[PDB]
Amino acid sequence: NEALARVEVAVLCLILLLALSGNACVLLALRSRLFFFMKHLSIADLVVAVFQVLPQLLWDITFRFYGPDLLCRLVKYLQVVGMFASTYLLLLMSLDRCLAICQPRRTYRLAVLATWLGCLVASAPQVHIFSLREVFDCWAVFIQPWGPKAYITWITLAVYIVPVIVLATCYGLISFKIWQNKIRTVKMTFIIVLAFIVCWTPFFFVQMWSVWDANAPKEASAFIIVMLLASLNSCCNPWIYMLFTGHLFH
């Protein structure tokens, strides 16, 4: 898969540069509470980008991890921390916006610290299940036949079901409250929900199909390509947020 490997590393570099540019373009707005949450989301997406695409990128370039077991566990832990943190911080920002619109500093710090603590707690079982195995790598030795399946279902519920439901309800409450008082709110909720779904559907869909092992075409090249694509969420979300408020860039 020499050509496939080259294409994969090229697209990984492209998504890395695009995500970094999107996160860093927020610095233009630096020189409100919306901005307070936007900066926090941007730094969370930075935490994601540095700890998510770089490890896989190095792994694919070198075709092997080539590192200590402790480094592998730490890298996996930070990967899961970023995956949970981006989604939970987006959810917290949406909840803050919905509460402000429907019902018109230190507590924000407390909330973000609580979300970070929850991300650490949810990322602990990842390393707990993952273990070194013989070339030595974290092959995630499973203690139960249903253990990997249960873990995948729990992660999917924590990262997809509850986040989509909460975000959709918050934005729907925003739209209903402004209706009780327009096209702008409908476009807001529609674009946000559509972006979240398009960012989180392919990875978790192929994940579920692979974990079921119901003759999953994991060998298919398209499946291999879409297996790695799970960081475009933080590549697009800040970009969508800045592009929506074109006055901010100008």
């Binding site: 490997a5 998510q52 896989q56 075709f63 060998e219 291999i224």
Partner: peptide, 9 residues
């Protein structure tokens, strides 16, 4: 690859 094993990297 993030919380599972890569089929073919």
């Amino acid at each position: 690859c993030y919380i599972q094993n890569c089929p073919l990297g």
